[PDB]
């Protein structure tokens, strides 16, 4: 309503944190997903619709900082891989853009503003079950692919 009429194209950040090295199977790289408690309880990265004045990535940075509480200052937009993630969930297409980001703060505080009340740092597999969306599972998997060329080596 206040952010415009209905959502059209939303944007979010594929947030992930890489540790010193892989342990048992948690892999050094993990994804940060949020479970909305004010809805039907779904897992998804910090992504929000784009207002009629903000930008696509700026919107992802806005949700990243708002939906999870992480500002871009502590995140590095690796980019490399990103596309308009599009899903209909219950039945609402809405375009979504996903960028790669890394928290240089291993102890970053995921502050969830009035919207999400759950957040976790998990590996691709655990991030895949929570996402439940083919694009998210692939975006998370495709996102990991580029990281292979990052400091993931």
UniProtKB/Swiss-Prot annotation:
Organism the protein comes from: Homo sapiens (Human)
Motif Nudix box, residue range(s) on this chain: 48-69
Assigned protein family: Belongs to the Nudix hydrolase family.
Clinical condition linked: Intellectual developmental disorder with or without peripheral neuropathy: An autosomal recessive disorder characterized by global developmental delay appearing in infancy or early childhood, intellectual disability, and progressive sensorimotor neuropathy with associated distal weakness. Affected individuals have hypotonia and delayed walking with an unsteady gait and frequent falls. Additional features may include dysarthria and subtle facial dysmorpism.
Reactions it catalyzes: P(1),P(4)-bis(5'-guanosyl) tetraphosphate + H2O = GMP + GTP + 2 H(+); a 5'-end CoA-ribonucleoside in mRNA + H2O = a 5'-end phospho-adenosine-phospho-ribonucleoside in mRNA + (R)-4'-phosphopantetheine + 2 H(+); a 5'-end FAD-phospho-ribonucleoside in mRNA + H2O = a 5'-end phospho-adenosine-phospho-ribonucleoside in mRNA + FMN + 2 H(+)
UniProt-recorded name of the protein: Bis(5'-nucleosyl)-tetraphosphatase [asymmetrical]
Cross-referenced CDD domains: NUDIX_Ap4A_Nudt2
EC number: 3.6.1.17
A Pfam family matched in the record: NUDIX
Signal peptide per UniProt: none
Record PTM N-acetylalanine, positions in chain: 7
UniProt enzyme class: hydrolase
Names of required cofactors: a divalent metal cation
Domain Nudix hydrolase span(s) in chain numbering: 6-144
Protein purpose: Catalyzes the asymmetric hydrolysis of diadenosine 5',5'''-P1,P4-tetraphosphate (Ap4A) to yield AMP and ATP. Exhibits decapping activity towards FAD-capped RNAs and dpCoA-capped RNAs in vitro.
